[PDB]
């Protein structure tokens, strides 16, 4: 390396990677969706969590790789050397925008602004605004403001998907229990019979294929 501080910064980032992946990437969504699938099928032990997480990580890799590569190719250019603090600072700042875009595409601006106004001590932290005036706030917002908003915005999305995924199986359960009451076999627990029906239903839908494809298609587009 040509600069000891550049080296230090690089190693620090490399040490923080897993928390950034766990808090600022689509992994947050894909991790949750598969576990909800397993619950809705009513399985305790199987598949293993590390099998599901392994798949989730592989899929998230495709989505995020283009940004990592763009930033690497941008930073490895030694084509300019820097007269001053502000020139360097701006050169660095302009490199993150490929990431900053992706966060701002999916978070929800009203939080972002709320946090911005909060880390500044401004006007005793919260005050009323008579006038509503939007100031190309897309380029202003700090990453330290963007990250939580993204996290919460995407957890919620995962719960929504899990809700939709539960309904078909609930139908099966109530139907089995009703036909058993029609037969008068009142003592017998449905779970002995309803489980295989759920299994064959999911196998016939081929839920893993549809689910995996649709998740990616929300972020990318492919022929």
């Amino acid at each position: 390396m040509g600069n000891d501080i550049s080296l230090i910064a690089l190693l620090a980032f490399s040490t923080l990677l897993p928390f950034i992946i766990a808090s600022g990437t689509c992994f947050v969504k894909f991790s949750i969706v598969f576990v909800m699938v397993r619950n809705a099928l009513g399985l305790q032990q199987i598949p293993s969590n590390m099998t599901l997480n392994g798949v989730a990580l592989l899929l998230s890799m495709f989505v995020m790789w283009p940004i990592m590569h763009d930033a690497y190719v941008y930073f490895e250019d030694e084509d300019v050397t820097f007269n001053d603090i502000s020139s360097l600072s701006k050169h660095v700042d302009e490199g993150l925008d490929g990431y900053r875009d992706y966060l701002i595409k999916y978070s929800d601006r009203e939080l972002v602004q709320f946090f911005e106004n909060a880390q500044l001590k401004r006007q005793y932290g919260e005050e009323t605004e008579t006038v509503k005036r939007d100031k190309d706030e897309i380029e202003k917002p700090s990453i330290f403001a963007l990250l939580p908003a993204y996290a919460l915005s995407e957890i919620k999305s995962a719960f929504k998907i899990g809700f939709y995924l539960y309904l078909p199986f609930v139908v099966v359960d109530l139907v089995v229990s009703s036909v058993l009451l029609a037969l008068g076999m009142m003592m017998m627990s449905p779970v002995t019979i309803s489980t295989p029906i759920k299994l064959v239903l999911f196998v016939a839908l081929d839920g893993w294929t549809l689910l995996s494809k649709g998740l990616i298609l929300q972020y990318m587009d492919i022929a």
Partner: protein, 51 residues
């Protein structure tokens, strides 16, 4: 102006609207510099504008 113009990314976040004439670009440039708070320079090849 007959010159390429370079504008800082800090200044490019300001906005304007209206109907304008460019009879004399230098004079117009000076009036708008003092009305908007810009600063500008000219090295003989390109005009540079900053906040």
């Amino acid at each position: 102006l007959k010159e390429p113009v370079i504008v800082s990314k800090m200044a490019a976040r300001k906005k304007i609207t209206g109907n304008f004439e460019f009879h004399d670009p230098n004079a117009l440039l000076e009036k708008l510099s003092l009305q908007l708070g810009l600063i500008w320079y000219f090295d003989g090849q390109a005009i540079y504008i900053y906040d």
